Amino acid sequence: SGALDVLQMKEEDVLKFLAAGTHLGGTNLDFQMEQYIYKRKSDGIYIINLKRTWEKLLLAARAIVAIENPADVSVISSRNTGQRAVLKFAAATGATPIAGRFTPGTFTNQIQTAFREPRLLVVTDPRADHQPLTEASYVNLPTIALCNTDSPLRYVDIAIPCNNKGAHSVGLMWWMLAREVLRMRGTISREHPWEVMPDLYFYRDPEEIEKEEQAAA
Amino acid sequence: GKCRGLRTARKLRSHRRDQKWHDKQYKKAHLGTALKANPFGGASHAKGIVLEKVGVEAKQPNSAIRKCVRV
Amino acid sequence: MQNDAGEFVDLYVPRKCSASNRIIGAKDHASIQMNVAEVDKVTGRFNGQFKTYAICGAIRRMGESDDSILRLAKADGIVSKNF
Amino acid sequence: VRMNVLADALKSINNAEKRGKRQVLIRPCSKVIVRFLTVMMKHGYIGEFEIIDDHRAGKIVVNLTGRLNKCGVISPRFDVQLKDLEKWQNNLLPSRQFGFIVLTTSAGIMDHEEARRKHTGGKILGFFF
Amino acid sequence: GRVRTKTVKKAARVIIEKYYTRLGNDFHTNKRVCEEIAIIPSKKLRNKIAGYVTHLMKRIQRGPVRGISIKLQEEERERRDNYVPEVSALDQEIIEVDPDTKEMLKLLDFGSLSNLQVTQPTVGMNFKTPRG
Amino acid sequence: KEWLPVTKLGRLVKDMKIKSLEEIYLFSLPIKESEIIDFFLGASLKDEVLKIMPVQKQTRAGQRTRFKAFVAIGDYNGHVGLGVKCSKEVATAIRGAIILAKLSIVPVRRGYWGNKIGKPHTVPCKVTGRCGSVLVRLIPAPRGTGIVSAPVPKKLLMMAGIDDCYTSARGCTATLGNFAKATFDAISKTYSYLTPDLWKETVFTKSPYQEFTDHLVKTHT
Amino acid sequence: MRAKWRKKRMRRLKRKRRKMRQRSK
Amino acid sequence: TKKRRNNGRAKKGRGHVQPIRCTNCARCVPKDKAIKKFVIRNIVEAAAVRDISEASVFDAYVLPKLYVKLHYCVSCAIHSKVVRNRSREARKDRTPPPRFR
RNA sequence: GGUUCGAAGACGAUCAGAUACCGUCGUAGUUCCGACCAUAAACGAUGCCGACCGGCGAUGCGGCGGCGUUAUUCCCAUGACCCGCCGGGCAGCUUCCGGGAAACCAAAGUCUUUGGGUUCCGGGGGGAGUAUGGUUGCAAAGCUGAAACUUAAAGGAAUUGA
């Protein structure tokens, strides 16, 4: 994860976190997350720490490298912000996504024919994605979650600090992980800048399709 | 126990005596009124001169005249 | 778990939490096992080995599940010192 | 008023074990409680600790190993015999395999396993299993 | 009270889903396109089904119908899933940074950036809206 | 007549691989199948019925009756159950309480009163168990005493394996359901009571999902 | 019989008797 | 058996409060316990905001509102259906009903 | 000292009958100054002093730190608005700290893992706060306060129905 200038944060990964707006946190605060916070602005916005982004982007991407079968990874977003960020992710690591609407009693219930049984849960937001995680109790499920300063920490085993509500911010955190797992396997080089573009993983609003199809000519 | 001191020993012991007189199967025991009332006076059997035969009715649900004596 | 004569009598040794020293019971589901991968110091790739851990069911819903793995990580040199 | 010190401290550490702090600060400190503490850290039910001499009475910062279900005290300190120590232990420690009863003898504050070797009864302070 | 039971709409979306090509708007023609292929044991039940069809065939001409996929707008759904822009949203030269975000990055090695247009936060720390 | 196992841990068992459910107990993985438990202990297992209880629910035309089967089980050597089920006839209720128990079996500890020379014979320390408002307690006790208690929590222990033990009790014992529930939980609390024979640390082994991962990609979806 | 209106009734048939037991002095 | 936490009345620093006469009945009710309302109302409501404006004196005029403060006992409230009974969690909602039109 | 109200009373309506609701009057009383009386669901139906065990959004009193508007213009500091820090106060919200028979309680928690110090008090229902004696008062009444006899249920919190 660190000490090693073979896994370290690059000059080519500072002007993507700033340009999207992932460091820009909130006003309210839960008592657990004050060890990922630098200092408050005069305006009312919590600036999230950026060394503790990289040192906690690779540990999580250290568990997914320690996971044995590509299938078992249950990736989720209910919310419509990053549902093109959990499906293209599946089109790089070979996970099993469930985007849009969780059918409760998925993990817990046998007799159904939607019957799942993963070994890791990578969920885009604990607060919204509530029903996922309580199920992560009744069967034992080492959990990951892209949390914020706001949310409570019920059934999660790592807390990655970032602004996870925006259009530029959710889909940018779903490429590095997939980058930094694929680099940790040897399928993309640490050398060649990775051929895929970061805008492949942001979800498309129905208001900028009327901008893009209608203005091409 | 509630008054936990090391030299209380009497405070503790004036309170239970006081108390046990509230106990029924005891006060019924520790006053002279139980044996003043009682026909046998304090005893397991005691003989007597009959004087008339008498039928007593029974109480409800049940009914049937019950055959008694007056001694 | 013996008599005098040293022979191991009790039918299974349970797990124990790597965080707090509380034994992880048999009908305790919000348990966890989590392996974490190691990575070659010059190559930046998987070595073929990990650094396992565990967390019990009483600690997760209490709130302190994401500040016990970092107190166990850090100390085995996975994560750097200053953080 | 704080009529009796020990039992401030002894619940405190227990209530920092149920919850589970890495260490516990316990406020006004004595030569019975630091003493008791060393008897515990002689059988492994806690680890090493530091006392903080502020010119009043000390504070103490123990480090709590999670090998500690409950600590407790007895009050008042009754007067025990060598003929009358079975029927504490036999009603105050859990098992015949583990448990300890600290008391105070003329020849020192110590555990009930040792006061049967030195053949000395005396008072009683608390227990730990 | 003309509302149709689940026997109808079950067998309508299951007849639009596969044969969207053959079918259409006319009631009197899909009255035959519903009968050639299927098994339907009543002429009244035959007519209920074959006209909700026409009720449902005019709703593919405006928006995406919920309980049913088709091969024409399911490729054009995924058209946008396979979109990539030409100039990226994040790789920008003139980026904005505050005098607290300037002093936290400089604590790390990134301490003399040539493309940080260092700015200021608006003076006065009132933000909240009143109560009632 | 086939056993067609659905889950990932049950398909493994059905292939004769994961050997001796002490291995599943270690990993705390939740059993929701019947035959696993039938497959490991089986003919070593003996059931009973302690009480069938009726209950009702006032409707507008009379009322609906039903019957309630609490059922005991567990080998004369270290594991037991205590399931319950409610249905509209009795041998439905019986059958489907047997199965629901076998589900929640648990493996009992046991130890020595005093001296150590032979075998383990009682509840290794003073443990208490409750449900509702019946508080059972299980005090350790010397050889050939026997089980000193009431009919209910005698007919768990006897089987359990715990051979000699002094009890206590509280509360409304007539509310059998609770009692029988109160002493089971209790024995559930032998393997979660930490002594200094278990202060020696944990050395981790491997879950059955991780080692059997290439075999399960080829045998069931 | 409500409580308060019973405790009138003990209170009215005690105050009569205090007339009675007076006269016999 | 207990049903409300704050027992029918806002009072936690006092012991005794001052009484107020119910304006439908005339019952004494504890200031805090009461149901209160406030009414602001032009002397023309909807129908009579038309006849006067064409046969009036002043070039551009405004009429006065009529301000009352009401006070209800509990059953005076309930009879006149200013307020309902409510379900057990529902109860809680001190969030007042929405006044848009 | 007697405006209003208003136990007792007089009428009018009401009803099978109403010495009850409503309606018209109206005494004792309602209000002051003096001395008695000592009880109320006198309530949080919840002893006082002590330690300890979570998270937040308000609020009142006192003290301290800090951008910027506004007032006295001439600014020194005092008032008014703005974001925290600490102490004592009345309440809230959130939650697998924990408890309980549940409702529910950050106390009603730290209780078969049963001991921080100390004061009042209950021991199945009625009979019965009765009789009696002693006590206190002008009086009504207040503090203390039994027995013979009488009976397998009173009762609590929650379910479904009607």
Residue numbers in the entry:
A (entry chain BB): 2 to 218
B (entry chain YY): 2 to 72
C (entry chain WW): 1 to 83
D (entry chain XX): 2 to 130
E (entry chain SS): 2 to 133
F (entry chain DD): 58 to 278
G (entry chain n): 1 to 25
H (entry chain bb): 2 to 102
Quote the authors verbatim:
Type IV IRES sequences, including the Cricket Paralysis Virus IRES (CrPV-IRES) and the Taura Syndrome Virus IRES (TSV-IRES) do not require initiation factors and are the best studied IRESs. A modular architecture of three pseudoknots (PKI, PKII and PKIII) is crucial for these IRESs to establish a balance between structural flexibility and rigidity, essential for interaction with the ribosome and with two elongation factors (eEF2 and eEF1A) required for IRES translocation through the ribosome. Type IV IRESs require two translocation events to place the first aminoacyl-tRNA in the P site making use of the intrinsic dynamic elements of the ribosome involved in canonical translocation. We report the visualization by means of single-particle electron cryo-microscopy (cryoEM) of two related states of the mammalian ribosome with a double translocated CrPV-IRES and P site aminoacyl-tRNA at 3.2 and 4.75 Ångstroms resolution.
Thus, to stabilize a double translocated complex, we mutated the second sense codon to a UAG stop codon.The supplementation of the reaction with a mutated and catalytically inactive version of the release factor 1 (eRF1*, AGQ mutation) causes a +20 nt toe-print signal from the first sense codon (leucine CUU codon) in the P site, which is in a good agreement with previous report, indicating proper binding of eRF1* (lane 5). The most populated class of particles represent a double translocated CrPV-IRES with aminoacyl-tRNA in a canonical configuration in the P site and eRF1* in the A site. Both aminoacyl-tRNA and eRF1* populate conformations recently described, with the characteristic bent of the mRNA at the stop codon. The small subunit in this reconstruction is in a non-rotated configuration and the 40S head is not tilted or swiveled. Given the conformation of the P site tRNA is completely compatible with that of a translating ribosome, we believe the addition of eRF1* in the present sample does not significantly affect the conformation of the CrPV-IRES. CrPV-IRES has undergone a conformational change that mainly affects PKI, but also the relative orientation of PKII and PKIII. Once eEF2 leaves, the back-swiveling movement of the 40S head triggers a dramatic conformational change in the CrPV-IRES: PKI is disassembled resulting in the ASL-like segment relocating to mimic the acceptor stem of a canonical E site tRNA. The mRNA-like element of the disassembled PKI remains in the E site of the 40S. These conformational changes in the PKI of the CrPV-IRES upon back swiveling are combined with a reconfiguration of the relative positioning of PKII and PKIII.
